[PDB]
Amino acid sequence: LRHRLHLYLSDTWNQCDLLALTCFLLGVGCRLTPGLFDLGRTVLCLDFMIFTLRLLHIFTVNKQLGPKIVIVSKMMKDVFFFLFFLCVWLVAYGVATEGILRPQDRSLPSILRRVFYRPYLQIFGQIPQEEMDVALMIPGNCSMERGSWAHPEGPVAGSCVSQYANWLVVLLLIVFLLVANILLLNLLIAMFSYTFSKVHGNSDLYWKAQRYSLIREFHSRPALAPPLIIISHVRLLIKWLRRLSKEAERKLLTWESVHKENFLLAQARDKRDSDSERLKRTSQKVDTALKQLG
Amino acid sequence: APWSDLLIWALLLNRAQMAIYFWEKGSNSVASALGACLLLRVMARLESEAEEAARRKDLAATFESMSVDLFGECYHNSEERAARLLLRRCPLWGEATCLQLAMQADARAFFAQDGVQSLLTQKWWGEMDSTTPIWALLLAFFCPPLIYTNLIVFRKSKRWSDFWGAPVTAFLGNVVSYLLFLLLFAHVLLVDFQPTKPSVSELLLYFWAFTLLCEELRQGLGLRHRLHLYLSDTWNQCDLLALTCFLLGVGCRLTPGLFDLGRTVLCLDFMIFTLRLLHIFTVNKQLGPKIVIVSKMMKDVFFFLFFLCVWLVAYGVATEGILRPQDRSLPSILRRVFYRPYLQIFGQIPQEEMDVALMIPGNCSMERGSWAHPEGPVAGSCVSQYANWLVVLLLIVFLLVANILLLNLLIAMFSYTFSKVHGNSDLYWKAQRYSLIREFHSRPALAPPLIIISHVRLLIKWLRRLSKEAERKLLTWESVHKENFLLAQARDKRDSDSERLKRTSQKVDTALKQLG
Amino acid sequence: GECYHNSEERAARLLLRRCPLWGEATCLQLAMQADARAFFAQDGVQSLLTQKWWGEMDSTTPIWALLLAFFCPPLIYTNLIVFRK
């Protein structure tokens, strides 16, 4: 039974349906031990997300929702282009801003929050101006170091930040919102529109072909709900331990042969009455007339 | 040898049917059709009469179409033997390869074939299989003795030099070492950047940028025409720009009076080295053509900025004029005129700075009229209450025009431009893809940090100073497919309806002459 | 179309010519009053309007050279802007 298991493991949603239950076994296993309670609760929460996303595969049999769910997976090359161009621009903006401003709280997760995580949320309209603009801040001698310094509001924005060349930090803010929120987001809408109109026909043909397989696999199931299927697996397990008429077919096939003969005759009459074939027969008749005059 | 001399003669004098007949009788036909296309386009630029220039360009498009069709049939028979047909130094055309003749002729319909693009993928993967997944290459790259296993299918000391000699691994080692340069630049700039003396890791950074400068100088020398072809480009001006700002940054950093200026220039220099990354990944099949399309959207962006700046000046000055804030410094006025209406496009709408009903009134001004006090260190200290409903009404009109007209019309212009441009951008990318593979083929075969020993090897080297019958079996196979192609083209032309109507008309003319 | 594909200088002199049979009006003025919009959409007519736009200067002069010659009025007498169209 190795070829069956490798045809099962070859798929994608069957790897996912295996994945949800492996994380369930890891979650309950860590939950029952008296030292790993919080780890087991965390794994079970991430396991809830996988069982919920299984729902999207169940509803691919529906006439209305089905073909649209099929198209969603074919937009991911455009999304991956968006993430590549974004991460290049997010590293460049985030490190340059964190470098000109010189915050004094320099833990490694605090720096990674200000470099990667704060410019990521500015795409979604979350622009903290009182963390990176000195005119919105209270100055003072907060640093025992040469230069001007100012104190931002927030537990995580650094405790004391530099005032030198702050107009360049504001100007990088203007350029970042221009490139990210105007170029990248509107070009991504342009690429989704192009890809959707290009792909929509082949996705509908692929869905109509697979729709028979989905109906046929709901036809052959244990005929009870999953909570109650255990009595049908017991019925199957004890069963494992124990081990059109003729003239209606003829009337059917003669009817089919009638329509085949009408189809071939109508195809032959449409081929004979075309203009190119009639030009061939006219050319042969004139050839006969030259032979009669010859 | 006779037909080749008559072919060159007919191309040099612009005789069309003469040159096509002399092409059909000769041999070595794919290379000679690409050389014909090259020679005619060089002449058509160097022309005075407009009619003769258009005549040479039309006849060059005929030869490009014939080389496309002939290689089509030679590829549909055998792929291995057509692969040996392109990669062959043609001795009749200066021992140049057919891909080099198609490159210099700008024959972009020849590169758009699926056969040529498959052979460029096999040239890309080198000795390895061209169906190797990328995860297997990454595991074999970060485990160098994992080459000697059953992971990577070979044959499309020896096994070692067949892995590390492919152009893909030169690409992948170039990307990994450039990401480690940026990670070192960020560690120096964000963690240990001392005010007096450069630390150990910053001196290592200076050494790395010296090796990147020597690699640019290696591609700048290898002399005035070469340097002006180098300076003519765009990303080579950028690759020169990142190192000039590095020299200005380190130069100002080492002086004891310009420390903050040098640190600021080095931060803006980090952005230029990071944006260089986008040009590196244009060789990739998935990311490459999309990166090419991004630069062709900027005329739509520049229309957006023109219409925005006109509307932003009008709204910003009218609002700053009706409200009369008392703090009237010049950078404070320029902040409220240009910078506050710019951020209202991105959802940042400060209502307590420009709406009196959200504000506390009082006699904050020694001047005639009603006055009110806004909340904020930069919104003015005291603002006018006269005709405030007009400031709110300008707020409504500004959000209507900017956030509904301009942003949604910009999405409409990006969609129109993208669908119009996408075909010519894919043809341009497929033509340039050979040049990108060929320039990763000819590199020093080490990562940039370690290329200095190969520039020393090159510098001491500077201070010291198919068989015959396999070619015949190849060219006779090509001539068989040329004869089948020309016969099938002639039989398809003869059996068309217009030609058959011509022959019918001549036969009836004969019958009138027999009756006459 | 045919008169432009032979010679561009001579077709340029063909349009800009006071036709004495039609009230000494130019061919561009007759096409303007007739609302002949397919006549103006030609690449030849649009090239002659670009040359009429740039005047005596070359029609391939970049805009930065014009700006530098505008804010430096004695910089006209240099080798920046090609003259005689």
Of B118, B83, B91, B128, residue with least CA distance to B4: B91
Nearest by CB to A147, from B260, B287, B290: name it.
B260
State residue B369 phi and psi, 5-degree precision.
125, 180
Q: How far apart, in whole angstroms, are the C-alpha atoms of residue A113 and residue A120? A: 10
Beta partners for residue B33, in sequence order = none
Contacts 24+ apart (CB under 8 A), A52-59: A53/A16, A54/A13, A54/A16, A54/A17, A54/A20, A57/A13, A57/A16
Q: How far apart, in whole angstroms, are the C-alpha atoms of residue C19 and residue C27? A: 8
User: Quick one: how far is CA C33 from the chain centroid?
Assistant: 19
Q: How far apart, in whole angstroms, are the C-alpha atoms of residue A39 and residue A70? A: 35
Q: How far apart, in whole angstroms, are the C-alpha atoms of residue A270 and residue C53? A: 62
Please tell me the distance in Å from B16's CA to the nearest CA on chain A: 32
Q: How far apart, in whole angstroms, are the C-alpha atoms of residue C85 and residue C73? A: 20
- Whether B244 and B238 have beta carbons less than 8 Å apart is answered as no
Q: How far apart, in whole angstroms, are the C-alpha atoms of residue B178 and residue B184? A: 10
Q: How far apart, in whole angstroms, are the C-alpha atoms of residue A208 and residue A193? A: 23
Q: Which chains share 3+ C-beta pairs under 8 angstroms with B?
A: A, C
For residue B57, give both structure tokens. Answer: 């360009």
What single string gives the DSSP state of each residue in C15-80?
HSS-BTTTTTB-HHHHHHHTT-HHHHTSHHHHHHHHHHHHTTB-TT--HHHHHHHHSSGGGGSSSS
State residue B154 phi and psi, 5-degree precision.
-105, 165
Q: Do B514 and A88 touch (CB under 8 A)?
A: no
Contacts of B74 (CB under 8 A, 6+ apart): B30, B81, B82, B85, B477, B478, B481
Q: Do C6 and B54 touch (CB under 8 A)?
A: no
The SS3 call for residue B43 is helix
Please report which helix (H) or strand (E) contains residue B361, including its range. Answer: strand B360-362
Task: Report the sign of the C-alpha dihedral through residues A128, A132, A136, A141, in that order.
Answer: positive
| CA A249 to each of CA A260, A263, B424: distance values in angstroms, whole numbers, following the listed order | 16, 21, 58
Please report which helix (H) or strand (E) contains residue B241, including its range. Answer: helix B235-254
Q: Would you tell me the crossing angle of helices B167-190 and B259-275 to the nearest 10 degrees? A: 160
Residue with tokens 């059709």: B33
- Look up residue B89 and give its DSSP letter: -
Please tell me the distance in Å from C1's CA to the nearest CA on chain B: 13
| CA A246 to each of CA A116, A249, B410: distance values in angstroms, whole numbers, following the listed order | 75, 5, 69
Instruction: Give the Cβ contact number of residue C40 at 10 Å.
Output: 13
Q: HEC string of B290-335?
A: HHHHHHHHHHHHHHHHHHHHHHHHHHHHHHHHHCCCCCCCHHHHHH
Q: How far apart, in whole angstroms, are the C-alpha atoms of residue B140 and residue B129? A: 14
Please tell me the distance in Å from C7's CA to the nearest CA on chain B: 8
Residue with tokens 């902040």: B335
Q: How many contacts (CB atoms, under 8 Å) link B and C?
A: 7
Q: How far separated are the first and last CA of chain C, in Å rounded?
A: 22
% helix, strand, coil for chain B, step of 5: 75, 0, 25
Chain breaks in chain C (C to N over 2.5 A) after: none
Contacts of B381 (CB under 8 A, 6+ apart): B325, B326, B327, B364, B373, B374
Q: Where do the DSSP E strands lie in chain A?
A: 138-140, 149-151, 161-162
- Whether B71 and B60 have beta carbons less than 8 Å apart is answered as no
Chain breaks in chain A (C to N over 2.5 A) after: 243
Residues of chain B in contact with residue A194, where contact means CB-CB under 8 angstroms, are 415, 418-419, 422
- Whether B312 and B338 have beta carbons less than 8 Å apart is answered as yes
State residue B373 phi and psi, 5-degree precision.
-115, 110
Residues of chain C in contact with residue B50, where contact means CB-CB under 8 angstroms, are 5-8
- Whether B140 and B127 have beta carbons less than 8 Å apart is answered as no
For residue B446, give both structure tokens. Answer: 């080490």
> Considering just the CA atoms, what is the radius of gyration of chain A in Å?
35
Q: How far apart, in whole angstroms, are the C-alpha atoms of residue B192 and residue B201? A: 8
Nearest by CB to A88, from B263, B274, B378: name it.
B274
Q: How many contacts (CB atoms, under 8 Å) link A and B?
A: 132
Of B381, B379, B341, B189, residue with least CA distance to B267: B189
Q: How far apart, in whole angstroms, are the C-alpha atoms of residue B33 and residue B486? A: 15
Q: Where do the DSSP E strands lie in B80-165?
A: none
The SS3 call for residue A138 is strand
Q: How far apart, in whole angstroms, are the C-alpha atoms of residue A168 and residue A134? A: 12
Q: Do A91 and B339 touch (CB under 8 A)?
A: no
Instruction: Give the Cβ contact number of residue B143 at 10 Å.
Output: 11
Q: How far apart, in whole angstroms, are the C-alpha atoms of residue A62 and residue A77? A: 26
Residues of chain B in contact with residue A181, where contact means CB-CB under 8 angstroms, are 346
User: Quick one: how far is CA B392 from the chain centroid?
Assistant: 47
Q: How far apart, in whole angstroms, are the C-alpha atoms of residue B110 and residue B89? A: 18
- What determination technique applies here? cryo-EM
Binding site per annotation, positions of B for Ca(2+): 216, 219, 236, 239
Q: How far apart, in whole angstroms, are the C-alpha atoms of residue A61 and residue A208? A: 10
Helices (H), B323-450: 330-334, 340-343, 389-400, 407-441
Q: How far apart, in whole angstroms, are the C-alpha atoms of residue B179 and residue B10? A: 55
User: Quick one: how far is CA B146 from the chain centroid?
Assistant: 35
Q: How far apart, in whole angstroms, are the C-alpha atoms of residue B19 and residue B11? A: 6
Q: Do A194 and B422 touch (CB under 8 A)?
A: yes
For residue B329, give both structure tokens. Answer: 């410094």
Q: Do chains B and A touch (3 or more CB pairs under 8 A)?
A: yes
Q: Do C6 and B50 touch (CB under 8 A)?
A: yes
Of B340, B363, B362, B335, residue with least CA distance to B351: B340
Q: Do B419 and A194 touch (CB under 8 A)?
A: yes
Q: How far apart, in whole angstroms, are the C-alpha atoms of residue B392 and residue B386? A: 12
For residue A25, give both structure tokens. Answer: 């076994």
